[PDB]
Structures are given as C-alpha cells and as structure tokens.
Symmetry: D4
Amino acid sequence: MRPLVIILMGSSSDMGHAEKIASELKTFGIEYAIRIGDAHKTAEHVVSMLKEYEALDRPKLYITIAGRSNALSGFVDGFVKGATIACPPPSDSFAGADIYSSLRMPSGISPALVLEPKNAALLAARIFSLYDKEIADSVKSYMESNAQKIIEDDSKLK
Amino acid sequence: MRPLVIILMGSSSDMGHAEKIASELKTFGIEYAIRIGDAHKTAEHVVSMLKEYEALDRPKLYITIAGRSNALSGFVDGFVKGATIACPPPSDSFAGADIYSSLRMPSGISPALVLEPKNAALLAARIFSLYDKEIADSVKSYMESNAQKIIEDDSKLK
Amino acid sequence: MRPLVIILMGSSSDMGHAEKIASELKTFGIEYAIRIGDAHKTAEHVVSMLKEYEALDRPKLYITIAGRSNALSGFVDGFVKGATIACPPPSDSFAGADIYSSLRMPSGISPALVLEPKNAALLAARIFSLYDKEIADSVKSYMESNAQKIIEDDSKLKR
Amino acid sequence: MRPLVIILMGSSSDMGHAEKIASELKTFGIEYAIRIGDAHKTAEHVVSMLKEYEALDRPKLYITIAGRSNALSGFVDGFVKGATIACPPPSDSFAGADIYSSLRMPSGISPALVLEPKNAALLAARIFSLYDKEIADSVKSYMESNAQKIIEDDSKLK
Amino acid sequence: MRPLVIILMGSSSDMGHAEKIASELKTFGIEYAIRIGDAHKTAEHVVSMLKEYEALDRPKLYITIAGRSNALSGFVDGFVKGATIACPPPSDSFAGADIYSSLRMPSGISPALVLEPKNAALLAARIFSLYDKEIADSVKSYMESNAQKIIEDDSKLK
Amino acid sequence: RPLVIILMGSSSDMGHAEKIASELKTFGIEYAIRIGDAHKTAEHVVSMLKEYEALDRPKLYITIAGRSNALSGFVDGFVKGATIACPPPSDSFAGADIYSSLRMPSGISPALVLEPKNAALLAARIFSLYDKEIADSVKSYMESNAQKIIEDDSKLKR
Amino acid sequence: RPLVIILMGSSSDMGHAEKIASELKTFGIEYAIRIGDAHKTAEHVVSMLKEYEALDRPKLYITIAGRSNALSGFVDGFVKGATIACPPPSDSFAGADIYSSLRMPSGISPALVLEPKNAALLAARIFSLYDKEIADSVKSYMESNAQKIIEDDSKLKR
Amino acid sequence: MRPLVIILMGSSSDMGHAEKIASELKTFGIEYAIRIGDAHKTAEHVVSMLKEYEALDRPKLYITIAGRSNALSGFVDGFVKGATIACPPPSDSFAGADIYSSLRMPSGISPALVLEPKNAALLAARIFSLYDKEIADSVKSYMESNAQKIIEDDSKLKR
C-alpha cells in the first residue's frame, strides 16, 4: 500500500507547525495523519496509538513535534520499528537551547533531526523515494523548481 | 512509616553519581533503592518498576538520573503520585547545555531540579523533614556541621 | 495544622509572577502567604520574617522569587529547616543566563529549582502529598485533568 | 540490488569517525563505501564521485561527515536524488557551536542530522527497513538487544 | 584597470544587506555587480558566474552574503584566485550562532569575515588601496570624515 | 593605613585569594584574609564585617565566591564603602558563573574584576585618589609593565 | 570637589550616559559628559584625558562604549586613578559584547558595573572612603532603598 | 617595491601564533616583520612603530594578534591607511567568547577577521595577488597542492 506519514505532536499548541509539514507532504502526494499525544502526560495514549499505526502493512514514517524539552521524539523512536524524524517547533527561549533535547540522544535512539518543517516533509519524501519512483519524480520536480526560482531571481538582476 | 528514596538512573554508567546520592542519604538515615531503567529504550520496564514502588505504603521520593537529553525525569514525574527530584549527571558537552532538557518542562510536570548529588539527598531529607522529626533532627545536625566547618576554617587561618 | 507555603519575592516588581504561583496553590487548597524582602538590602527584615514563619508548628514550604542574580533562594534555604523551592521570574537577558545563579549552589544549600510558576505550585503540593491524602487527591484530579485535555484534543483534531 | 551507504568525509582526519559508522553498518549487513572529498577545495572531484554513485540502480543513502563549518552535507544533499544523513565529527571548539552549520539548512536542503555515529548507521538501516524485511529483522534484534542489556544491568542491582 | 567588486548573495531575501554594501562602494567610486546564487541548490550556476568574472582582466574582490549556515563564502573562496570577503546578513536566531559557519573555515579557505556591510565595503576599498591611489585618497577622506563627526559631536554637547 | 579585607566563601578559594594578597603587598597595602559563606554562615560574616566597619581607616573589601556568587552582593549591601568582586575562575557551563557576579539589582554596586592582580591594582588605584604614596606605587608598577613590553619588542624585533 | 568624567564612544550612548549623570547629581557629585572613540579619534581622547589628568582634585572616569569595548581599557591604561566601565545594554549575540569589557589583561583594571545607577553609586562609594559628605549621601540613598522594600512588604503583605 | 606584512602582537606570549603566520608567509615568498606592542599599555610605542611602517612606499598589510579582549586590531586599523587582518590567538575561555571582541567593530573600523594563522597568511597573499602575478602563481600552486592531497587521500583510502 501507499506510504504513510504520521505527524505526532505533544500539544495542540504545535498544530501550526504540524500543518506546515502536512501541507508540504500533500504537495508530494504523500498521505499523512495528524495526532496529538504527550510522552510524559499521556504515555499510554501514545503507546496505544503507535501500536495501531505499527500494525499497518505499509511503509511508514513518524514525524514527532514537541516543544520545550523534547522527550516525544525519543519515546516514539524507541517504540516503532522504522525510521522517525524529529521536527521541533521553533523557540527562542534560552537562545534556542531547547534544540539540545532533540540532538542529544543515547546510542540506540536515532530520530532524524530537521529544523524546517518543509525540510521534514522533503526528507520524508526522499526517504520513500529510495523505493517509490512516483515520489522520486515528485522530489525531482520540487527540487528543480527551487533551483530554477533562484536562477530566475538572479536573471531579474543580471 | 519510614521514608524511601528510589534512585533511578538511565544507565549503569551513571552509577558513580547515584552512589554519591545514596551515600549521603545513608548519613541522614534514609533508606534508598538504586535501580536502572531508560525512558526511551525500556519504558515498560520502568513503568513496571514504578508500579511496584508506588504500591508501598510509605512516604517516598524518586531521584531521577539521566545524562544527555533527560527524558527520564519527566517520564517518572508524569507517572508517580508524589514529588520527584531530577539530578542529572555532570556533563561539559556543549558547555553543559544538556541541563536545558531537565529545566524545560511543560506545565504539569514538576520535578525538582538540583545539580549536586549531595544536595539532591539534602533536598530529599528536607522534604521528609516537614513531617519526620527524626530526619529534621538529622538535617539540623548536618547543616549546623557544615556551617561550623567554614567558621573553623576561618579561625584556622595564618 | 494544615500546610502553609510562604511565597517570598525580592521585589514588588515580581508580584505578577508570585500571583501565578498563589493562584495555582489556591486550586490545590493550600494556604499561602505572599511577602517581599531582599537578601542584600533588607537581610534583617528577611531574617525577622523567616523567624516568625519558622516558629509555626505546621508543614511549610518557602517558594523564593528573585530576578537577576538570585541570592534570595540560597539565603532563605540556608536559614530555614525544611525544604524550599526557587522559582525565578523569566528573563531573556543574556539568553536567559540568570538561571545559572539559581542552579549553582554550594554543597549544603538545596533549593528545588522549577521554572514555571504553575509547576512550583504543583511541586509544593506533591511534597505535602507524601503525607497529606487530601492534597494527594487534589494532585491526582489535577494531573488527570491535564492528561484528559490532551486526549480530548486528539479526539477532536485528529486527521 | 542490495542497499548501499556511501560514507563521504571531507578529510582523512575524519576517518576514525567514519569507521565507527562503517563498523556499525556491517553489523546490519549493509554494504558501504568510504570516500574522501571536500566541498570547497575539491568540488569537482566530489561531483564526479556523486555522479558515479547516483548512476547505480540500487537504493542508496549518503552519510556526510565534515568538521568545522559543515558545507559538505548540504552540497551533497542538494545534488543527489534520495535522502542523506549528516553525521559531523564531535568538537568542543566554541563549546560545540560547529553543530549549527549542520542544523541551519535553507528550505529545500534536507539532510537528516544525527550526532552519534552508531545512530547514523541505525537511522540508515531503519530507512531501508521500510522496504527491506531482512534489514528490518536486523534492526529488531539490535534494538531488542540494547533494551535487554539495560534490564540485565538493573537485574544485577535489583 | 579599475577595480570590481562582485556582491554575490545566496538569496533575493539578502538584497537589503547587499544594497548597503553597494551604496557604500559607490561612495568610494568602486564599480560593483550584484548577483544571486545559492551554493547548495544552484552550484553550477554559481560556478558559471564565477568563471565569467574570473576572466575579466581587472582587479577584483568577491563579497559573499549567505544567511543561516553559510556555505557560499567558502565555496566561492575555494574557486576564485584572489581574495574574498564574507559578510553574512544579521541574524538573532540561536543568539547569532550562524556566525560560526562563517568563522570556522578549514586550512586553505581564507575569506575575510566582516560583520557590518559598510565595513565590508571599507575593507574592500582598503584592499584595492594598496595599489590604487585614487581609492586610497577616497578612503582617507572617508575615515577622516568619520573621525571629525565624532569630535564635532563632542563639541556640540551642552 | 588603608586596609583591604579579602573575604572568600570557601577555603578552596585560598590560592585565588593569595594571588590578590601577594599583589597588594607589592603595593605596600595591608590586607586581611578571611573565610565566610553568605548562605551557610551569614551571622559569622556580619559579625566579621562589623568588626571591620568600625575601624577608622580607609578600607575596601575584595570578595571571592565561586559558583553562584551571593557573597559579593551581601557584603556590598552591608558595608558603607566600595567593594570589589573577584570570583575564582571556572569552566563550568562555559564560565556562566560570571553572570551571578554581573547581574546586580540597582543599589548593589560591587566593582567586578576577573584577574586577581587586577583586583589588587583597582584597590590600589581607588586609594590612590587620596593617597600619594600608593599613587606613586601604582605609577611605578604600571610603568614597569609598559617598559617590559617595549623591551620585549626591542629583543624579539624581527 | 570630586569630579566624574563620563566618556562615551558615540553620541548614540547619550541616554545611557545621562542615566549615570542624573544619579551622580543626586549624590551631589559634579560630572562632565564627553564623546570620543578609542579607534577613530584616539588623539582627541588623549588630549581630553590630559586636560582632566592635570586637575588637582579627586577624579574618576566612567567609560561607555558599545560593541567591542576598547574605550575602557584605553582610558584605564592612560589615567592614573581608578576607572569604571559601564557599557550600554545590547542583545546582540545574547549580550556577548560584555566579554570585551570583562577580559582585560593583567595591568588594566577598570571596574565593571552593568547598571548605570550602580556606576554612579560605585563612584560615590569610592569617594566616600575619604569624603564624609558623599558618605552621608550614600548612607541616606542606600537606607531609602531598603525602607522602600520594607514598606512594599507592609503594604502588599498577604 | 615588494609587499610587506607587519605581524604585530600585543604580547610576547603570542609569539608561537605569530610564528605560524610568518612561516606560512615565507612559503608564499612574502617579506614579514614581527613586532610586539600593546594598545592600552604602550600606545605611543605602537603609534611610533606604525608611523615608521606607514611611511614605506610599498604595498603592506598588518596582521594583528591580541588575546583576551582584542583592542589592538581596531587601534591599528583606525590608524593605518590600508587594510588589516585580525588573527587572534585561540582561547577556550568562556567557550571562545573572546572572539566577539574581534568581530564587533564600529562602522568605519574594518579589520578582516580570520581564525587560523595559515589562513591569515593565505588571505594576505591573496590580497596582494589582485595586483601581483608572482604571488598569484604561488597562491595557485598552494591551493592546487591542498586539493591534490585530498584527492590523493581518497585514491589511497577509498573502500
């Protein structure tokens, strides 16, 4: 079956950030789910949700979004079989130092960290593209279009 | 009933830090248990253990020790009923920025952060001391002793 | 007698922060007092106040609020018998580096550091709850409510 | 054909770090190549190398390793079709601030950042595992073994 | 032959910063070109452009402007023969830590880092001034003028 | 006739204090060296300051406290005259203990100086405003420092 | 009879300087306010300091320079008596300009104070060692500060 | 006459750092002078020295080396006509935060900041190379050699 991306955020306050990821997945033609669950406060709810998705026989990725000290990405990553992507929401608290909670994983916990929500979506697409030629075609068009916009911007100048 | 402190560390590599906490609790006459469990890799093992301690009919505190990005303190704090203390092991990586993973809790997750292991033990004692006169007496002796050492150091000069 | 939390701040400029803590303590049914006193400029005043609260035969906690370089939390913690909680006001000066003045205590000075005012109240409640069943019931209702709101948000907004 | 991981480092001084990644890929039964090329000094050499690998009709990932200001990961990522992983070598220069050069990509450049070399290898395996059942089996054993070591460590204690 | 400064920016979003540099070069009577090209997304476009400028038989400098992780300055510096100047746009993200991506060059890549755009222009002028007396005269007038403004500000007091 | 009271929080600070004391002695300025902690032995410190505050002579206090420095503010809030904070060096959290000495509220005004020889020099130059002997001593000291640099140039001139 | 010379690097620093001057006036201490840059108008600064250094009266210099503060060290290396550095506030690079005022070599000893009211108070308390009038003024000031806190408690006592 | 690079350091303690720069300039065939002088303690000495070098009719650069808070690079840059290069010694104090004293110049003070001593030499060479073909040839040989070593390492060590 088709690829699936599960976008899991710790709080409804993260929804703006999540929708940016979702919007971009939609341009790659990649199905997504958007869910809310907190690692520390609703662990059992999160586990029961992950079991449901894990049971689907289709290629899947999880993109985990948690502000402040991000425990969610590692929690999900240590539970599910396949790859996951951490895409924390932006914060300038302590000059951005919440980022270290996403970076500093133990050996054996391996979420892919990406800062920009459009890049989390692009990484997800490029992961599927190793085996999905339709998604590979979409990635090519997207990345070529990004390069062409820059060159055109220069042409408007010289 | 007599107090219990459960010292839970994410890794056997944290044992030196744990033992400093434990040694200090012993000077206050406070029973402890030392346990190992990782929030991301062995979550079910941690829950199982917490349920066992939570069922004991005695006043209890948990002191949680986890290096790198500390997910363990919030995990435990979100599960148990009573208060908990976060006492992460020291690290100089990224100028100590692992500390932000212990600091930056969501609303509703409230571990007490203390840096020095002797102070984690002292805080625990002083928490019990609100209701346990035996421990209050021990705390008084301990803090008076600390102060007298300094005053003595001054008189010893020249 | 019932628990008491003394909320002591270094400056009246911190009153809003103190009120957030007191507001949350009220939800747990915990009596509080709000006081002002500075460790360096009004030490004797702070000592006099602490002696009065310390003489009360009831379980107590102090929550200490001081901006910039926080000397109040250690001063109070070194004086009183029981536990204390540091909950400094937030600051973005020097990328938040005032926090290190609350973190870096000498051995023998052990205030509990908590950043969020609601969490300072919750920690206080959970400290009393080791021996106080009624406060433990309140904590449980509070923490269950927080969880249920998250699950309800997922039930509504999930796609 | 079988998956391939191309480990590309900017300098021979990075070889120790690269070999940790390679060693771990070998435990997952994943073929790898180890190569050296600098983005700024040997761009054409890097491009000619990437064209050679890109022409292989097999699932591939690139893991890019560059110290100091990491320009290599983004350079590779903007050239190749599929996903890439940035795994910079550790440094304590400016308290680790070289990490921001790997983090702060423009929209449209999406390398997966992972700090630990064993985790770069595990992420690579888990990426292939979405479609490769043999690698999925290896990941399961690996991650289960990591969890079991922790539980056993606790058992030696309580 | 008369000097040329090529102002190359990674994005059209950098134009305000570029124009401050350009405006200041105009006060020194130094010809400039403003161009757009991204190191990671449009590398071939950048190389093509550099070859065109490199073929001009006149003394030239490149001022490279790129936000976030600055790969552009080292890319250009590794390609062209003569000196280059890095003048990244200002950013307050992560307490300005994007600056380390411009600072931390490998041995063999030597762009001049200057923060203020007016100073990037002044450095360029002063570089040419070692051999161009017309520009030396302009630089002298400019720096003398700056000093006289301050002394005047002092006398204007009260 | 002036007196400098060097007060340190811990006997661990002695090496730092003695660097200050030695330098003060080359200025021919009498000093006292004392130990006392602001949080643990507050009464001992006050009793001590009262003894010094009663002396009819010019005096300065140089206060030395590691970690979070509460001692300088405490002393400064109590004594009439100026004080100097000279904290011991630390690499903990990339030296962030320094902010506890910097960030004083309005009304608490210790002079912050990092180098112990400079704490002594500031003390001297403070007295030198009214003490012709100390001023002569400062002039000789500062001239010696300059002549050494110049003779280094004359010797290692290349 | 004492004099405080407030020297700022740029007219942009005036608001900061006037906060210092206003406070000095409540202490009844005469001040001068001057503008001069260490790098651009070094001769203008020296000529100015020579005028002040010749005056037979107690004097302090409070030096104000934004960005990388070279002014305080320059002034301190030239004048006989003590000086005070009071840099203007900045959020650039999370306030890292402060290190240019902190990190003096042995032999250069300006007193660093962050708050302008505290720069004035330090100045006063420096004179107060030999000036009974200023000392009385300091005592009244510092007592007023304390009484206000206490009456705030009495008023907002809950 | 031929180019000259004046390497001026604030303290003899920096001599090793200066030597790394001079060593690299020698490989490019560029004459250098090594001098010592401090901006705050020996200003007049520094000015006197700069006046002597400034009077020479030859292309020159100054490379300025000062630890801790770097006031030397701006002082020299504000005095001399032509370009200068700041190359401070490395420090790990405060996580390397001395670097901000070399970065944060006022408008009108424009030293080129470069961290590595070999790169300060290369930048100097590349500045002269805009007008000096012989130095341009040397730069090209240098930069080609660096590239070829990397490619050779790949050819040996590739698996």
